[PDB]
Amino acid sequence: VHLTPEEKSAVTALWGKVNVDEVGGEALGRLLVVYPWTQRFFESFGDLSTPDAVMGNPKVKAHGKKVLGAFSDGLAHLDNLKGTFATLSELHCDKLHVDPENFRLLGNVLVCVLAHHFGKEFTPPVQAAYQKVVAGVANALA
Amino acid sequence: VHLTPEEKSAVTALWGKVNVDEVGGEALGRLLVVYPWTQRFFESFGDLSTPDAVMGNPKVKAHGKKVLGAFSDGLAHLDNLKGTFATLSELHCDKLHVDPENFRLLGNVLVCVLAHHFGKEFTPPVQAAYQKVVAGVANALA
Amino acid sequence: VLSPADKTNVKAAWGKVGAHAGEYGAEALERMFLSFPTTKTYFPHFDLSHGSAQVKGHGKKVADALTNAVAHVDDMPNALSALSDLHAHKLRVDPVNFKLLSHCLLVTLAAHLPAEFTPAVHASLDKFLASVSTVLTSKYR
Amino acid sequence: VLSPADKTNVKAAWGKVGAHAGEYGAEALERMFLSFPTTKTYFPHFDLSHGSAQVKGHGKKVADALTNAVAHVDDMPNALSALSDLHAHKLRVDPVNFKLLSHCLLVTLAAHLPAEFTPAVHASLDKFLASVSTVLTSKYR
Ligand code: HEM
Ligand code: HEM
Ligand code: HEM
Ligand code: HEM
């Protein structure tokens, strides 16, 4: 996961404009709605029974924020991603088994949510930089 | 990739009984046969037009051996697997520049051919030790 | 797109399995649970140790679902309708897990049918198991 | 597999795309070629740089294949018959790559239709694209 400076620029230039308080919840919500089997990994998380139900379930929105944090943490330490998400997957015991594909799906959902919030600004090369990131972070959680 | 000692016993014991010269060729042919798209990465290898053909093709059989060779060397270099399939992916330029999934398909096919040759000796615990291995390897090459 | 020849290879391979139906289903489960331990979260209320009455019983249940698909291979969606619902809606099974069992099922066949598990028969059983797995996941799509 | 309300959501979403059809297929391809660079091996005889006339035409070919699936959503295998054949037999496309284009297409719509890309609509578009990909890859199964 070596990002070139242009890749680094693209990711961080956009990630400062991010409504941190909400985009995590948008991303985690849309995952539980678009890929329903992911609800199994929560549903001990309130009512997860509709788009609307999920989009405004408080523990969704709250854990969205952690997800976004987790991500910025990957940003600041690309070259050592397994060592940043070390105590992360560890402090979860056995809540982060799932299969690495659903980390990749979460990361693609986030990409969809960024593009949704930035439109034209989320250009194809900006996407490519983020895909590199989501990729390395996914594979870290493993 | 931590193999336990009994996982290690399982793998190595079976692995010495293995007729190297061709189990590799059996596993690479079944790949081109079971998942046809993978022929695109060869077909320079000659005719890949029927089960019978792929199984017979000489370059299939030859690279079967190389493939088995890569495996024994991952067996002898688990904890820094990346630090072993480095020369491997590098000397290929952009020949292993394909989705990680297909490295995992090759692994499973091999597991099938090992079970095929060892029947009852390929117990579920022996299989599981080998799944750990193919996984670390695939994640190394990519 | 199961061709006439995949259908022939699958009915064949199956027939040889014979009554070792459930047994081979049990072993596939056991292979799955040891090789892919994430999968064990779906069976918390099971004992998953060797010789489990519960893995035998469910292994027989999975083998008969499969036999049913074989037996109704041209109308698998209707045949597996209720199982599509169970796995997708009810149990919320991650779709990846069907690739893992399918593979433990082909490993188990390989190990018990060294004569029947030719390249051609392997490819047709894989196509068959991918078609079943597609149905069982079709209430996600 | 596709509910009446998926069908409504997908036809709605294509509605707003309007004539930006080909364009958005072009851009989805470019997102795929830049984000998933293995995919470029399928297009060697293509110049894949920004504003390629070739990525626009192909991008318009892909956009009309999909509009055709939408128009014939209840019989996609017959509709997409000839493209199933193209993609699996002639071109031997790796199935994983359909998941990648699908994602780049969902990302392109997200970027061009902020109001229409509700969670519900995103789900439906994901399901529609998964059914199309299942068709395009069905002559492997
Ligand atoms: C999938 C990506 C996930 C990420 C990135 C993530 C992130 C985090 C972070 C950063 C923390 C520490 C911060 C803090 O404690 O305030 C934490 C703790 C925690 N995580 Fe997660 N988590 C994920 C999935 C899950 C799942 C699936 C569960 C349970 C079903 C879960 C349950 C918890 C709990 C209970 C805590 C500590 C207490 C709490 O705040 O609820 N997480 N997680
Ligand atoms: C995917 C798993 C693959 C493995 C494990 C593998 C293994 C190897 C190894 C170990 C060598 C060096 C031989 C030695 O020093 O003993 C080699 C060389 C080579 N590889 Fe591969 N390879 C793979 C895929 C491919 C592909 C897809 C191609 C495409 C044509 C390819 C083409 C070649 C060629 C032409 C050589 C040099 C000539 C030869 O020794 O055959 N390989 N490979
Ligand atoms: C070839 C693919 C599969 C077939 C044919 C199949 C078949 C079945 C059948 C027939 C039942 C009903 C059993 C009964 O009535 O007692 C069932 C239930 C169940 N299936 Fe599957 N299944 C498949 C794949 C999977 C996978 C991959 C998982 C999860 C990893 C899974 C998890 C379950 C669970 C948890 C139950 C309920 C267990 C219980 O409470 O008894 N199945 N399946
Ligand atoms: C939604 C999924 C897809 C659709 C609707 C689609 C559609 C099409 C169409 C309509 C054509 C015919 C174009 C013509 O005759 O000029 C075509 C050809 C082609 N498709 Fe796709 N395709 C899809 C997925 C893919 C993927 C994932 C790849 C590769 C990664 C791919 C690679 C190709 C290639 C290489 C050609 C031939 C290029 C040429 O020589 O002009 N397609 N596709």
Q: A91, A95, A97, A99: which to mutate for ligand 1, most atoms within 8 A of CB?
A: A95
Residue D111: its H or E element: helix D95-112
> Could you write out the DSSP letters of every residue in B27-56?
HHHHHHHHSGGGGGG-STTS---SHHHHHH
The b/e string for B19-45 (b: 16+ C-beta within 10 A; e otherwise) is eeeebbbbbbbbbbbbbbbbbbbbeeb
Left, alpha or beta for A46 (phi > 0: left; psi -120 to 50: alpha)? left
CA gap B23, B67 in Å, rounded = 10
CA gap C86, C83 in Å, rounded = 5
* Beta-bridge mates of residue A46: A44
**Angle formed by the axes of helices C96-112 and C21-35, to 10°?**
130
- Asked if B117 contacts B23 with a C-beta cutoff of 8 angstroms, the reply is yes
Nearest by CB to residue A97, choosing from C38, C88, C93, is: C38
CA gap A90, A96 in Å, rounded = 9
Q: Which of B39, B59, B62 is nearest to B49 (CA)?
A: B39
Could you give the number of structural domains in chain C?
Answer: 1
Way the structure was solved: X-ray
Helix (H, G, I), strand (E, B) or coil at C31: helix
- Asked if C118 contacts B34 with a C-beta cutoff of 8 angstroms, the reply is no
Q: Which of A92, A142, A116 is nearest to A34 (CA)?
A: A116
Q: List phi, psi (to 5°) of B119.
A: 30, -115
Helix (H, G, I), strand (E, B) or coil at D116: coil
CA gap A38, A33 in Å, rounded = 8
Min Cα separation B34/chain D (Å): 9
List the CATH number of the domain containing C48.
Answer: 1.10.490.10
Residue C44 lies in a domain: yes
Task: Give chain D's length.
Answer: 141
Domain ranges, residue A96: 5-140
Centre a 10 Å sphere on the Cβ of residue D45 and count the other Cβ atoms it contains.
Answer: 6
Could you give the number of structural domains in chain A?
Answer: 1
Q: A48, A63, A94: which to mutate for ligand 1, most atoms within 8 A of CB?
A: A63
- Asked if A34 contacts A109 with a C-beta cutoff of 8 angstroms, the reply is yes
- Asked if A54 contacts A60 with a C-beta cutoff of 8 angstroms, the reply is yes
- Look up residue D7 and give its two tokens: 């069908």
Q: Which of C105, C74, C91 is nearest to C139 (CA)?
A: C91
**Residue of chain C nearest A94, judged by CA positions:** C38
- For ligand 1, the distance from its centroid to the CA atom of residue A59, given in whole angstroms, is 10
> Could you write out the DSSP letters of every residue in B59-70?
HHHHHHHHHHHH
Residue C50 lies in a domain: yes
Left, alpha or beta for D2 (phi > 0: left; psi -120 to 50: alpha)? beta
Atom of ligand 1 nearest to the CA of A45: 30
Min Cα separation D39/chain B (Å): 9
CA gap C25, A109 in Å, rounded = 36
CA gap C110, B108 in Å, rounded = 12
Report whether A2 belongs to an annotated binding site: yes
Resolution (A): 2.2
Atom 12 of ligand 2 has which residue's CA nearest to it?
B66
CA gap B95, B12 in Å, rounded = 29
DSSP category for residue B77 = T
Residues with CB under 6 A from ligand 1: A 41-42, 44, 63, 66-67, 69-70, 92, 95-96
DSSP category for residue C88 = I
Residue C112 lies in a domain: yes
Q: List phi, psi (to 5°) of A44.
A: -75, 35
According to DSSP H, which parts of A16-123 are helical?
20-34, 51-55, 58-76, 81-84, 86-91, 100-118
First-residue to last-residue Cα distance in chain B: 15
Domain ranges, residue D10: 4-137
Within an 8 Å CB–CB cutoff, is residue C96 touching chain A? yes
**Angle formed by the axes of helices D4-17 and D95-112, to 10°?**
60
**Residue of chain A nearest C36, judged by CA positions:** A99
Q: List phi, psi (to 5°) of A21.
A: -60, -25
Helix (H, G, I), strand (E, B) or coil at A124: helix
List the CATH number of the domain containing A130.
Answer: 1.10.490.10
Residue C29: its H or E element: helix C21-35
- Asked if B81 contacts B136 with a C-beta cutoff of 8 angstroms, the reply is yes
CA gap D7, D9 in Å, rounded = 6
